Design a protein around this nucleic acid. Sequence first.
RNA 1: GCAGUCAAGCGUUCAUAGCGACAUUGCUUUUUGAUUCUUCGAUGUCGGCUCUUCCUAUCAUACCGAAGCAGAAUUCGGUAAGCGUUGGAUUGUUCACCCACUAAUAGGGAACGUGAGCUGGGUUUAGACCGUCGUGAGACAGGUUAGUUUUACCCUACUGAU
RNA 2: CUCUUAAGGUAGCCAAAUGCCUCGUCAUCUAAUUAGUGACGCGCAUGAAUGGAUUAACGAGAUUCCCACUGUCCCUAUCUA
Lengths: 322, 136, 141
Amino acid sequence: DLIVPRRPEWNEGMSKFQLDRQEKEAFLEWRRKLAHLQESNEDLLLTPFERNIEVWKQLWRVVERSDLVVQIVDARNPLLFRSVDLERYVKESDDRKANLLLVNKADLLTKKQRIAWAKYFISKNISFTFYSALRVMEKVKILSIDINIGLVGYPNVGKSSTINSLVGAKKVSVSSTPGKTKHFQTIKLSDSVMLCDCPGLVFPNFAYNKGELVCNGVLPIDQLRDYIGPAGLVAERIPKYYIEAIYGIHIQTKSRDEGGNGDIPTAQELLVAYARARGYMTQGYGSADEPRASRYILKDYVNGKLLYVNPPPHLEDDTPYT
Amino acid sequence: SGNGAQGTKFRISLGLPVGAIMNCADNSGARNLYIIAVKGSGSRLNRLPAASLGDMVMATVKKGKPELRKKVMPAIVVRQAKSWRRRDGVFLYFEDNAGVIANPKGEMKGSAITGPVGKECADLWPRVASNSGVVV
Amino acid sequence: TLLCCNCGTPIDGSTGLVMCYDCIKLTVDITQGIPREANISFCRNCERFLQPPGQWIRAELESRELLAICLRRLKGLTKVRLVDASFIWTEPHSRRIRIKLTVQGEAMTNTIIQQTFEVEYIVIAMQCPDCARSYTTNTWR
RNA sequence: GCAGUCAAGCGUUCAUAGCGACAUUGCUUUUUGAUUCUUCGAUGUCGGCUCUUCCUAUCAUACCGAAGCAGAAUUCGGUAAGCGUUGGAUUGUUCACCCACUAAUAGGGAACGUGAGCUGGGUUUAGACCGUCGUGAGACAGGUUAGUUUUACCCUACUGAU
RNA sequence: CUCUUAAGGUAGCCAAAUGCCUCGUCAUCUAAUUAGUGACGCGCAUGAAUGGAUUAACGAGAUUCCCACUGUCCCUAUCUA
Ligand SMILES: [Zn+2]
Ligand SMILES: [Zn+2]
């Protein structure tokens, strides 16, 4: 539901104090809804909504002065990366608006998937475009070619490397961490336009909070402690032969045929076929350590080597086909 | 000894000290038990404590059902390989050191015990004797 | 088809279970051994705070490492399988901090039960001994 | 570091059942500082292993007394040092922290006990690497790595033997 | 716009044999780890042939963990020259 607050009446007045306070209060009362929707659903569900006054104030320096904002989204699960009420929000000053969201890194999805998935956005008559940034229907995937400019995105969905296909000049910092690029940078190029990015953020995607799929880049995979949810999800996907295919390991002959695991084992019978095949053993006794081998498969699940894609808006058995 | 133990046990040759890894004999899903310390132990310099048949220990699990391990729990031995002596003079020894998981009051965690069990533990802990099929 | 064996009336399932949910809710407790108010310390010049013996963590208000110091605070919370330690909001000016904790203490015999309990963390102002003495003038290095 | 007298006041109203001001007298060498008095033609310098004994400012044990001491459980207190006071992870470590048992896991001394008793991880030679300084040789009490530990057959003591 | 006479740490890497504070912070290994590994980086004082980064193989090189193994240890005992 509600996600992003408003930018009320800069208005060209005075009182730096006032310009501070009318946004500080906005933040204090913006977060109220978050707490209102916090106990709203059960009393456990809670997605990663930042509460930093500093970055929430920095966001009020960039979008309006850009007046043309564009979104970056990973092409593996593009619903949660999208912001619901950002469309609703960027319609407040009565001027040039309509962020007109886009998607990014579309060089993993196949032919008979991409068109039936463009039907999603088109059926809801919304704007979008596919863009392979590393390297209405009459398109396949448009090349690099196709007044200020905003560039917002989720952490490390590729926003810090999308500009390496525009100028290719290595202007902004990038690694595989969700907290790198900070202290917004107005990158100048083609002086008729001026481009500004922002620090990364995380918005109120209430759908799928605990039993979800935000183990992509949202929480630090380099710092996790659950190691069964974040690993067992990959077990429900990626049929047994493909992990036998890449790594070459021998997992199980479906021993426990009762309601313990059955087919598609869980995150206790395959992680012990990896670490025991990698020699990663504990301190005290030879035992296949799971949680430090789950961080050697999860950095392979998200970078793009082990691939799984979203199914249509209805519950569907097997959309991907390796 | 009275951590739920019924009577007073005679002395038994201290077979398995700390650092020892003894099999588990219950259906709790644990497959071994690493002893770390002992109850009723005595304190002498450089003497690491030890556990005999019937004794209660603190143990860790090193193989099985990862909701069990990486925590300490009480355990009770039921077999040892060190030959001890019953007061009828006979000596006897099993072929494997083996124990059982329990709570601090003497109640077991599982429901049955595979393999034989010592008289000197069954007489002392009744719940063990209840879940046991073979006593020597 | 069993009886609650504490009250008696609740015929429950044989999935493997114990006395009635109301009976375990009211009589049995597995969160004992903790104060529900915790007094911490904090500066009013550098905004710093610590555990009683240790270095000041330097973390700002509403940081992730607040949970680190708050778990490092000596309770029996560490004993039992912590999970879902998310933050609850409290008024900044009323100088209180609130967290809800949930630990899975075992019931009688291998029956795992949720627990929903809350704790409040209150703060008192210090002046930071290391930050002071430094403003005092004793022997130099 | 420890003790004693004044004890604002906190301790359900109930100045010491208990904790704590302002100070004030004053103790031990088991702490730093200060001195340079003894050793500069050899007092072998960290810690640990081992082993013995002593002190009490008592952690437990025994016996007593008082408590917002019903019982239970605790706290404080008095004589009291007879007996005991651990196994382990990390660290060279003293110190520290943590796990676990335990009646308890108290503090200290004997040339900061103890190298012809051991070890040599550390410091403290020469080799060599990094960082900073320096024009440079070279410096760093900064980090890292490698690096010879000697003699008793004498006197006494002690243990045992004539 | 600039200030010192020049330029102003780029790609890359990191509590690294370079990091004082420091037993840095987070996670993990452990019953417990000032150790070890992975990640973070305003880095006292990293850094590009005063060479940077990665590297299969090799190493009487330094360091951590595991299986096996054992008188290293619990805790000592015995035999021979
Ligand atoms: Zn009931
Ligand atoms: Zn301060």
